[model samples]
Target: KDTIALVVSTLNNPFFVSLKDGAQKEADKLGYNLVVLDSQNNPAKELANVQDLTVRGTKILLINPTRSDAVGNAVKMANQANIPVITLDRQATKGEVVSHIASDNVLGGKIAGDYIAKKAGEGAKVIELQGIAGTSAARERGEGFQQAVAAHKFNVLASQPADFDRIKGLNVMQNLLTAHPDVQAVFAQNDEMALGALRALQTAGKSDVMVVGFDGTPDGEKAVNDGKLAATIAQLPDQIGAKGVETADKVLKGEKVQAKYPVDLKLVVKQ
Candidate 1:
């Protein structure tokens, strides 16, 4: 058995932590030694992590890039070391990656947009909360959401980057609410932001504003059940992590894998 290394963007959040656990569980059954590293959402740290893994003779590299434009050099370093690369949840835009695995982020965004717009009705004022600025997940989701909402002619009062963090989402929403108190609905790119936005809405006596969120974390689904969130786009982060290892094993066996692996996503709503 050879060594496989997984370099995650960050583990400070529940999503990436679950991803790490899923990869580890899969690696355990496969009898492959796996080394996991967290980059703390820093591009420089991701590069350092890849370099260290490369020199350690890692047989394969699984990466979740913090930014699409920032990981090319690190990926190239792995390439020079003859390590096969697989990217999860985000794109590595600059390297010869063997495969990519992610739940359909774009489609998830569109569904959230479609739901919120339909529920809020034509000409309703809406707010948008975006994720990390430079990652493919953010770009793709934002694109889909923008297109869907634009088609409906809803007045998007404001759209801003919240870095996919709960606190930032809360603060941003609070500020936005002050300016656009009549905002009727919200679409947050991730669950963390959604929950934060919900907290702000509640605190400001705007609990009637409908919220549609992406990344169906348990908390997000619970919020849906509690009637706090209108709906959430559920993504299988753990399954994506597990598949990365399985795919890496296949690559080592000289078995070809698909260039892109599409995982399914669903919308969670109150039953």
Candidate 2:
């Protein structure tokens, strides 16, 4: 059985943790030996991990890039080695990517934006908590949200990166509140940051502020159900992970796979 290397950016978050689990589970079911590596959110580490996996004779490479541009060299290296590379949740800006598995993030962002903008109504102020800078998720989601909100009179008070970390989200939101205490809505790029923003809002007693998050993680969904989060763009990381392995299986069998695999996303609202 040929080995498969699943190089995830970081398994620290619940979303990525689920992705790793799904990939490994499917890999085992297919009788393929799998090696999982974490880049710990470092671009340099991400490149190194891919190279090491390539050196270990990994037959197929599955990667979730730290950033779109940062993984170009690694994907190029895989191409030079004649190994198939599949990207998950992020795209490689340079080099050949046999297949990419991810949600329609732009649409997901629009869904969140539409919901928040309508609820906040005209002239409402909003804060945007961004994900890691330079990542595709941050860029696409921000673009979509901006597009949707621009139609209305919603004022984006501040847009800042929280690096998709819960603690950073809390800290950033705290600082933002100092300047824009009257903000009525918050759109976080992911659930971790969303929850952090929620905590900050509660601490400041801004209970009326509507918060929207992405990634549909368990915590995010629960928060929506409990009315802590107004809404969330639910991404199926588990489905994406399974699809990556399935595509890798096809690649190994010399079957053609599509260039892009857009996983389904759902808008999870308060119940």
Candidate 3:
């Protein structure tokens, strides 16, 4: 009988789509009403969505923030209203969040780094294609990756943001390839960018470059299976969403909840 609002970053990406579906199903099973609001990758929209939900007497909030900093004001609105906020997938920088349900993105990045290091050898030049700027996911993933590679003496050639877009990935990779064609490895923070990088590498006749990606999207997994992508770290968004809703229920019931619930991650490579 309780109503909870889930503010998703965007339904445009299949990852968030699955997240919504999982949360919705879990809410249904728990007999709690789950209302979803799409941020559409806009921080303003997310704020408006949260405020609207607050006005409607929605008991709890499940936020998958578009950007850590921009989502701060949105979460603050919830804090002022005294509504409990549970973050999913991405976190907000400022707020009284009750709990977080997300994958270990930093670990996933480290996994990617370890794989690349083994495949390309120590001191090999590597490229890093980043995601949208200012997002926690982008920052943590890059941080973990760089730290892991640093342990192995990997030489980083370039680190640039692709806005987590396929087209931007291709364009950025093309530019980076032109300047650092001698690079031995590449790690695109997400699969869309990684696939785009793969296309660019294939076109440039440099498919020999070891490439890795995060987010085991369908196409990304296929690339791994086809032996095009070196590896992809899997962050199961479905589990994150499902657990978020369940945790929200626990919070409403006045039961103790964890400060954070981290979902499992896997490294997907050619079988």
Candidate 4:
């Protein structure tokens, strides 16, 4: 039986774990054998995983790219093999992706920035905790944040990558804090980093900063409820994964699918 290959960047984060689960559930329901591969956040591994899946004769490819630019080659190879490629969460900058499924990251970033600005006020200092460099989420979210905060006069104390890892987020934030002690707010590209930053803030006994995050994972939601986090952007990764599989199935059946399918984004705050 022809299989469905689900290529994920990393299963370390809860968001991608939920995404993988959703994809597996849908693929099983649709009578397709699912094969999952983890790239471990390496671009070369991502490419190799794609090649391996295609070589093993997958009917369709569902990939959550590690980085937008690096995954283009993998998608191009899939195209050459006549395998339909559906990208989830992150898109390939090059190659023929049959369907791209993801959240409106730009809008989420704007919401994060706007909320931070409103809470911090004009000229307030803020730190940006970025995800992996070259990832579409990082770029788009940063762009949106900058755009929203440009007119508000928020001072960006520092912007650094935490590789979407909570431990890295903590370390990076700790270092940034030593240099800019009066930061009034933080915007982490994802919830993992945001939670890490919050930990760092707690260690430093700094609780006054407004910290906003992305990806409304269980931890993030709980943090918001507990008043530890100011807010989070709910990216609905489960919906994205399910939609990716559905779109891939349609493509396999020779049905026309749109170039992009955006999942909804909502701002989650403490009530």
Per-candidate Cα lDDT values, in order, are 0.90, 0.89, 0.91, 0.89
Better of 2 and 3 by TM-score: 3
Candidate 4's C-alpha runs over 4 A off are: 1-99, 237-258, 261-263
* Better by lDDT, candidate 3 or 1: 3
lDDT of 4 by residue, 1-271 (tens): 4578899999999889989988888888898778999999999999999899878778899999999888999999899899889999877889998888988778789889888877888777999999999987899899888877786778899999998999999999999999999999999999999999999999999999789999888999999999999999997777888888888888888999899887778889999
Quote the lDDT for 87 in model 3.
95
TM-score of 3: 0.63
Candidate 3: C-alpha lDDT: 0.91
Residue 4 C-alpha lDDT in model 1: 78
lDDT of 3 by residue, 1-271 (tens): 8787899999998889999998999999999988999999998899999999888878899999999888988898998888999999777889889998889888788888988888888788999999999987899899889887778888899999998989999999999999998989998999999999999999999979999998888999999999999999987878888999999999999999999987778889899
lDDT of 2 by residue, 1-271 (tens): 7788899999889889989888988998998887899999998898889888778767889999999888999999888888899999988999999999988777788788888867888667889999988987899899888877776667899999999999999999999999998899999999999999999999999889999999888899899999899998888788788888988999999998999887777788876
Model 3 / residue 140 / CA error / Å: 1.5
Off by over 4 Å in 1: 106-213, 217-225
Q: Can you rank all candidates by lDDT, best first?
A: 3, 1, 4, 2
Per-candidate TM-scores read: 0.62, 0.60, 0.63, 0.60
lDDT value, residue 44 of candidate 1: 94
What's each prediction's clash count? Answer: 0, 0, 0, 0
Candidate 4 displacement at residue 21 in angstroms: 16
TM-score of 1: 0.62
